[PDB]
Ligand binder design. Structure first.
Ligand SMILES: COCC(CCO[C@H]1CC[C@@]2(C)C(=CC[C@H]3[C@@H]4C[C@@H]5O[C@]6(CC[C@@H](C)CO6)[C@@H](C)[C@@H]5[C@@]4(C)CC[C@@H]32)C1)COC
Length: 1199
């Protein structure tokens, strides 16, 4: 026991891992560490060289101020301005070169690292034991292959380079500010740190508001999950407003937290735009104060102030880059946990023996095993079977007996705790696992063909064989012989291309028989010694089964086969038959020897014989008409927030003019002017604080209101669709839930802080351009020509970063699809021992992809680096032209610096809107999606249409008539379910419908509830076609009890009152359903929460609750769609008692699986091929000795 539990856990145990940047960068080998080192050096250099514009700008400001005061001649002014302009040009060239190299090398390093990670992950997954792989499923592996490697790239991509660059920019800016002027640098740093630590509660408030909103929608998404999954019940009982209200009570909490988010974001914006203005004001004021004792200068004051603001305002890009780094370190932890986990079986290694001249004899001895998923159920107990070369065993039994476990043990998919399996006398636990899998040939129930030619598909079976490395000409002969031995040449030679025809997602689309015949050829081409047929023909049809069975019989006549069959008629010629029940060999023997024994095999063959006998702005603007009271003041607020910066420009120009001292004699006047202008600078820096607070608050409130409206209307629109909408493949529950989660949240990109920043940006740019033209027309025209350049650079930087982000996922699609295809089926790949070939092909593919992507990245990085280097060139040109104008007398120091601050610096602040450009693509795709969703309507079955006759309850009888009803499910329209059905149910009749699987009796409920409309026919209620009746009232007439009871989350009172057409009736119906006593037994009364398995009541109790729910409305037509199919025999008694009690006094249509429920029905209708075959009472159908007799005999035999 301590050993078997250890084995069953070590089979499935999954260790936890913590990945750091060391693990990611350890995939670089040899000369690829120089690439990473050079990338980081270039990033650091290009980040540290950026705050030198502050040095050159301060020097140029000092030169302009000194010349305007007449401290040097024209020639010296020209010389110094030219030299400083060249310094700008050199800085721009250096920024270009280093940005290019840093970005290119970072991207290349990320490509290399992720290629190594992908190779390692695929090599691990392909060699894990099948117990662990079945634990994860395919979804966990396919997701890890496609969207968890992209995150690992982004972690080590140019994002980490930008994070390092930004940290270097902060360090270099602080270093510049301290060296040039530590007195003012220290003062500014202290004040800014005090104003940043003070705004710490606001950041906590924002993060709490985001967490609360995410949690509240998480709860709301759960209500949507149940509503779409349980959509048949909701439509049948009209619980559309109930589920919509449940959703609304949770998407209103998100709006309340969005309010707090609005205040917090407004506070953060106001604090930032107050810190900047207070830093300018304090820098100028305290630099004028210090200057009367240091003679430092406006140049040094500007250098210090600009350096401090530079480093502080570069922090925001660093945070998103570090978020990107940390997101890719969480995925790295998962992938490295899945890589470093060592498998239970060492199938990768070459250890183990290899039997020479393997005859094929197998000898099981006392074999006992458990699956790791369920360590209490024993799926095989004391299995003993000695198989000789050439024999044909045939394991049979009921489902769950454990016949299929033998094949899993022989292929080393799972581990047998106790026993012994000997291949020609050699233990199975001491053999090379891949060799053992090569000696066998697993023909599975579902054939899996890979997207390749038929020749390649059949050649996949040659792995490890002696024919693996031979001439291609010989291989084609072998494939032809194998396809002829498998009865596959008849449809391959008839093909267009023949053996080279593509299959799978390309080329031709085969049938089940043809795919199974190609799988048989693939299995037989290797000349296996053991054949493992695992219900090969269980998934085929009557016509196609013959050819595949002939092929299998031809194959099994020589090899040591182990056939697992569900059609017992195909194994009559087996050399031995083993009957398994609950994991034990109940009896064994030949076909004749077992029939005479009157045993389990006889019952199985009897059952088999009996069965054989049988522009989008205006859209959202119109939707959010109610929020205008918030967006009308926002225009005025944005206009004021826009006048702000072009008045800081005027005051800054006047301050720079006031710093035109010629000696300590002019210091009192300079101090007076600096105080007078710094007062106004601080007053303006406080007005914009309030303006930004109000504007951002109002805009974020509007955005949250729009998101709430989108969610509410989208959920309301999903509930209006007919049942033909929800059974489409693209309207899955998990897809609709995801769409609700994403699109009403992505549409927020066209409102809120983004729209506020858009308005503020355009106003700021327009006001700055107008100010530059008005102050000096000769200087406001040239500097206007640079506004397109600066704005284009600011936009295209973000655009190219988006391009870099998207290339990561766009490039690795072919190889990811190939890997996901070969990982969708691990059992077939592992059976063929195709790990090595798949890994080689995948490794070659991604190695080629690295080189293919490096070139395109090198092409784009040139434009990115040029855009990065443009800015110092614009500065140089502007300063040179300004100096020339100021020499000619056509400009002034005040006018030049006012124009410069406004134009250049205003375009810098308004480029923050371009950081919201990535959202505007999502916010347009989501707008298109929401427009499509909000406009879709059901063709005829509209629950929210008020047209149609109303059913008068006084004259209602309850007569249902299906007149010549023909119906096909629109998802599968080639398979008719009901054909020319004629069925009349008299009022008060307890009609029961019975039949075999696929007869289509359950479609009667769908037609009566009007889930679907019949293609040709007429369903009538009291002589009125239900297509001409009011849908809500009509469905209020009917009631429905389903096979699997569904109870919505909430109290028992809420669930049972879902089917309330209009407190006494509730108690009366709860007593009539034999559930009132159980409810009274509960600690609370009808307030017990049975949601998400809150109390997990018994199936009988949940069915009785559903019966009471259907019974409150007092229906005229009670539909019981196999109510007692999933109930225990003890609870079935009370449930059937409740059903019989409820069936009195109303029309009752009872679809039945167990024929005992329909025993006392007034009329019984037998279904076959969608048409009524027999009809009448129980005794008459028994006397007719027809299909009903066969069904009751089958029920008796099944027991
Ligand atoms: C945007 O919303 C994203 C959302 C929720 C994230 O919550 C917040 C977590 C803190 C974070 C990263 C956020 C916004 C601005 C960020 C701040 C800007 C400020 O700038 C500085 C420097 C410059 C100074 C002038 C002001 O203060 C920093 C100290 C401040 C800052 C870097 C501190 C961290 C802030 C988002 C998650 O979405 C998946």
């Amino acid at each position: 026991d301590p050993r078997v539990t250890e084995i069953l856990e070590r089979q499935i145990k999954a260790d936890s891992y913590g990945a750091s940047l060391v693990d990611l960068y350890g995939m670089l080998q040899g000369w690829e560490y120089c690439l990473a080192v050079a990338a980081y050096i270039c990033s650091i250099v290009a980040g540290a060289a950026l705050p030198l514009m502050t040095l050159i700008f301060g020097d140029m400001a000092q030169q302009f101020t000194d010349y305007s005061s007449g401290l040097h001649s024209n020639n010296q002014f020209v010389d110094k301005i030219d030299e400083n302009a060249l310094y700008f040009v050199y800085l721009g060239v250096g920024l270009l070169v280093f940005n290019y190299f840093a970005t290119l090398l970072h991207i290349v390093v990320s490509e290399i690292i992720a290629s190594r990670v992908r190779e390692k992950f695929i090599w691990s997954i392909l060699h894990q034991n099948m117990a662990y792989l079945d634990s994860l499923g395919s979804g966990e592996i396919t997701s890890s292959i496609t969207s968890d490697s992209q995150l690992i790239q982004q972690g080590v991509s140019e994002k980490i380079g930008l994070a390092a660059q930004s940290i270097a920019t902060v360090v270099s800016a602080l270093t510049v500010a301290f060296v040039i002027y530590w007195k003012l640098a220290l003062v500014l740093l202290s004040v800014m740190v005090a104003l940043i630590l003070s705004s710490t509660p606001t950041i906590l408030m924002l993060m709490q508001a985001y967490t609360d909103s995410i949690a509240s929608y998480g709860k709301a998404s759960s209500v949507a999950e149940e509503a779409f999954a349980a959509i048949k019940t909701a439509t049948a009982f009209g619980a559309h407003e109930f589920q919509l209200q449940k959703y609304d009570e949770f998407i209103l909490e998100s709006k309340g937290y969005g309010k707090k988010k609005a205040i917090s974001l407004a506070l953060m914006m106001g604090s930032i735009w107050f810190i900047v203005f207070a830093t300018y004001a304090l820098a100028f004021w305290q630099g004028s104060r210090f200057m009367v004792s240091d003679n430092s200068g406006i140049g040094k004051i500007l250098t210090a102030c600009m350096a401090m603001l530079f480093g502080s305002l570069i922090i925001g890009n660093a945070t998103i880059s570090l978020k990107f780094v940390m997101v890719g370190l969480s995925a790295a932890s998962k992938l490295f946990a899945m890589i470093n986990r060592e498998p239970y079986f060492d199938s990768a290694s070459d250890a183990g023996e290899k039997i020479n001249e393997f005859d094929g004899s197998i000898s099981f001895r006392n074999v006992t095993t458990r699956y790791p998923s369920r360590p209490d159920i024993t799926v095989l107990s004391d299995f003993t079977l000695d198989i000789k070369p050439g024999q044909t065993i045939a394991l049979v039994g009921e489902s769950g007996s454990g016949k299929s476990t033998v094949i899993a043990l022989l292929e080393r998919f799972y581990e047998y705790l106790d026993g012994e399996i000997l291949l020609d006398g050699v233990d199975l636990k001491s053999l090379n696992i891949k060799w053992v899998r090569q000696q066998m040939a697993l023909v599975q129930q579902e054939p899996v063909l890979f997207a390749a030619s038929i020749y390649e598909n059949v050649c996949y079976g040659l792995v490890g064989s002696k024919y693996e490395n031979v001439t291609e000409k010989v291989k084609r002969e072998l494939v032809e012989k194998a396809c002829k031995d498998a009865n596959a040449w008849e449809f391959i030679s008839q093909m267009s291309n023949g053996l080279d025809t593509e299959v799978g997602e390309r080329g031709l689309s085969l049938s089940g028989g043809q795919k199974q015949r190609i799988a048989i050829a693939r299995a037989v081409i290797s000349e296996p010694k053991i054949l493992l047929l695992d219900e090969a023909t269980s998934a085929l049809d009557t016509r196609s089964e013959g050819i595949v069975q002939d092929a299998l019989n031809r194959l099994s006549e020589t090899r040591t086969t182990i056939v697992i069959a569900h059609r017992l008629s195909t194994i009559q010629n087996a050399d031995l038959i083993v009957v398994l029940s609950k994991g034990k060999i109940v009896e064994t023997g030949s076909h004749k020897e077992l029939l005479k024994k009157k045993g389990k095999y006889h019952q199985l063959v009897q059952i088999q014989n009996i069965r054989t006998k049988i522009q989008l702005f205006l859209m959202l603007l119109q939707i959010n008409k109610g929020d205008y009271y918030l967006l009308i003041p926002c225009l005025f607020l944005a206009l004021i927030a826009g006048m702000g910066f072009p008045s800081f420009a005027l005051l800054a120009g006047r301050v720079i003019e006031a710093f035109q001292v010629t000696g300590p004699q002019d210091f009192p006047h300079m101090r007076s002017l600096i105080n007078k202008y710094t007062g106004f600078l601080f007053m303006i820096g406080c007005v914009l604080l309030i303006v930004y607070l109000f504007l951002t608050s109002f805009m974020v409130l509007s955005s949250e209101s729009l998101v709430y409206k989108m969610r509410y209307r989208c959920f309301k629109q999903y509930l209006r669709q007919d049942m033909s909408f929800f059974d489409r493949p693209e309207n899955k529950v998990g897809t609709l839930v995801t769409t609700l989660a994403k699109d009403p949240q992505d549409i927020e990109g066209l409102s809120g802080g983004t729209a506020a920043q858009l308005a503020v940006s355009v106003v700021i740019v327009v006001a700055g351009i107008i100010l530059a033209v008005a102050v000096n027309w000769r200087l406001g025209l040239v500097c206007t020509a640079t506004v397109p350049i600066l704005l284009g650079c600011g936009f295209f930087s973000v655009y190219l970063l988006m391009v870099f982000e998207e290339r990561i996922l766009k490039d690795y699609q072919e190889s990811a699809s190939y890997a996901c295809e070969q990982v969708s089926a691990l059992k077939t790949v592992v059976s063929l021992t195709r790990e090595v070939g798949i890994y080689e092909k995948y490794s070659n593919s991604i190695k080629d992809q690295v080189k293919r992507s490096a070139r395109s990245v090198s092409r784009t990085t040139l434009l990115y680096a040029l855009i990065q280097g443009m800015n110092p060139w614009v500065f140089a040109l502007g300063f040179w032209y300004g100096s020339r104008l100021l020499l000619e007398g056509r400009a002034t120091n005040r006018e030049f610096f006012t124009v410069l601050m406004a134009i250049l610096f205003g375009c810098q602040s308004a480029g923050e809107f371009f950081s919201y450009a990535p959202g505007m693509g999502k916010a347009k795709q989501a707008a298109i999606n929401i427009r499509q969703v909000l406009d879709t309507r059901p063709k005829s079955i509209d629950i929210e249409s008020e047209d149609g006759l109303k059913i008068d309850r006084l004259n209602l009888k309850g007569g249902i008539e299906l007149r010549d009803v023909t119906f096909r499910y629109p998802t599968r329209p080639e398979v008719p379910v009901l054909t020319d059905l004629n069925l009349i149910i008299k009022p008060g009749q307890y009609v029961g419908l019975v039949g075999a699987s696929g007869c289509g009796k359950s479609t009667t409920v769908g037609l009566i509830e009007r889930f679907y409309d019949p293609e040709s026919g007429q369903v009538l209620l009291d002589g009125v076609d239900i297509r001409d009746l009011h849908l809500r009232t009509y469905r209020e007439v009917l009631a429905l009890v389903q096979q699997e009871p569904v109870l919505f989350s909430g109290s028992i009172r809420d669930n049972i009152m879902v089917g309330s057409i209009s407190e006494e009736d509730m108690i009366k119906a709860c007593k009539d359903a034999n559930i009132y006593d159980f409810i009274s037994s509960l600690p609370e009364g009808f307030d017990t929460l049975c949601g998400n398995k809150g109390t997990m009541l018994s199936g009988g109790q949940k069915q009785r609750v559903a019966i009471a729910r259907a019974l409150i409305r007092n229906p005229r037509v009670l539909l019981l769609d196999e109510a007692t199919s999933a109930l225990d025999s003890e609870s079935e008694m009370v449930v059937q008692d409740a059903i019989d009690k409820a069936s009195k006094g109303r029309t009752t249509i009872t679809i039945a699986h167990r024929l005992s429920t329909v025993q006392n029905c007034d009329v019984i209708y037998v279904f076959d091929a969608g048409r009524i075959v027999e009809s009448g009472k129980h005794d008459e159908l028994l006397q007719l000795r027809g299909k009903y007799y066969d069904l009751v005999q089958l029920q008796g035999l099944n027991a």
